[PDB]
């Protein structure tokens, strides 16, 4: 822990500065540091952690997809032997992506999830676990691919179970969870019907609970509902 000597509050403060400067690797490092202090995270702090890592891995995923696209094209015969370079560089980016995923999953396992007793914290962390297994699934090709897929599924399902018992259908975390779990069904599990069904049911259940919300809550909920509708339009 290179952040071991810095105050928890200073790490959080610097994470917020890193966000403003769009320094997401720095942000993730500061938030990792904060988690490793061993105290539970607040709502705002969980959001900082998620934003930092989503941006770091988001960059790596975008790069990996570019490199994989080149690798596949260069392996379509008639292209003339590229050499090992595209594969080697795709593998380098892939390994760095897997490292980040393992880091996040490590933080969740040691010991964010086990200490998370409230619905919002537990659902948030379990959603994250599902997400970082999904990212590993996106690049997995070998012996463990199925077990990686099922780890994502298991985390998402546990999050869903808690969210349905403990949260209203408009809760943005519940909505975000269902959004991402739906994408998992479509893109990873090869289950477009399950994806569509989950997104539609989630959208309709939220619609019917919107009347209970303030103007601010309504904005947050309808933001995620729009993303559900966007995906459904993509898929149907």
């Amino acid at each position: 822990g290179a952040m071991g000597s810095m105050e928890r509050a200073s790490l959080i403060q610097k994470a917020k500065l890193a966000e403003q400067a769009e320094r997401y690797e720095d942000m993730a490092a500061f938030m990792k540091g904060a988690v490793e202090k061993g105290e539970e995270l607040s709502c705002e702090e969980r959001n900082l952690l998620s934003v930092a890592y989503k941006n770091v891995v988001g960059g790596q995923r975008a790069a990996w997809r570019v490199l994989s696209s080149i690798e596949q094209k260069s392996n379509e015969e008639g292209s003339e032997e590229k050499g090992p370079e595209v594969r080697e560089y795709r593998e380098k980016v892939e390994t760095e992506l897997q490292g980040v995923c393992d880091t996040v999953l490590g933080l969740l396992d040691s010991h964010l999830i086990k200490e998370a007793g409230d619905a919002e914290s537990r659902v948030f962390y379990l959603k994250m676990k599902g997400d970082y297994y999904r990212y590993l699934a996106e690049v997995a090709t070998g012996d463990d691919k199925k077990r990686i897929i099922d780890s994502a599924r298991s985390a998402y399902q546990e999050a869903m179970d808690i969210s349905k018992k403990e949260m209203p259908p408009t809760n943005p975390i519940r909505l975000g969870l269902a959004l991402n779990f739906s994408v998992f069904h479509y893109e990873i599990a090869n289950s477009p019907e399950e994806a569509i069904s989950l997104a539609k049911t989630t959208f309709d259940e939220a619609m019917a609970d919107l009347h209970t919300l303030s103007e601010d809550s309504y904005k947050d909920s309808t933001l995620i509902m729009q993303l559900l509708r966007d995906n459904l339009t993509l898929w149907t």
């Binding site: 997400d131 959004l179 991402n180 994408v183 479509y186 995620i224 993303l227 966007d230 995906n231 898929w235």
Partner: peptide, 5 residues
């Protein structure tokens, strides 16, 4: 990339 959050 479909929408995720």
């Amino acid at each position: 990339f479909p929408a995720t959050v």
